Amino acid sequence: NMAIVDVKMVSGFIPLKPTVKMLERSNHVSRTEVSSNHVLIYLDKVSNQTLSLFFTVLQDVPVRDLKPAIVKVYDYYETDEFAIAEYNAPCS
Ligand SMILES: *[C@@H]1O[C@H](CO)[C@@H](O)[C@H](O)[C@H]1NC(C)=O
């Protein structure tokens, strides 16, 4: 019935408050938070129709080459059934 989404960041960059704040105030979002660059968006309930999420991540450390970070999505009840999906940076 319920679910949670994790997002590990590449090298070292975080987002701003008017983009993190704007996520909790939308359909299916319980809490938006970041635990040591793991940008977790706490989803409310699971649904068949597609739901899109978005925000701006500001580049701090410009020492870059080619590393795509991970995305996780496991339900709040049974954490064994999830789906991985690595995303690459816009420059890499
Ligand atoms: C989701 O999909 C199933 C069929 O795949 C459907 O029976 C159901 O009504 C849909 N919605 C919910 C809330 O389960």
Curated annotation (Swiss-Prot):
Glycosylated residues, chain numbering: 48
Tissues with expression: Secreted in plasma.
Subcellular location: Secreted
Complexes and interactors: Homotetramer; disulfide-linked.
Family affiliation: Belongs to the protease inhibitor I39 (alpha-2-macroglobulin) family.
Function per UniProt: Is able to inhibit all four classes of proteinases by a unique 'trapping' mechanism. This protein has a peptide stretch, called the 'bait region' which contains specific cleavage sites for different proteinases. When a proteinase cleaves the bait region, a conformational change is induced in the protein which traps the proteinase. The entrapped enzyme remains active against low molecular weight substrates (activity against high molecular weight substrates is greatly reduced).
Name assigned to this protein: Alpha-2-macroglobulin
Species, as recorded: Homo sapiens (Human)
UniProt lineage: Eukaryota, Metazoa, Chordata, Craniata, Vertebrata
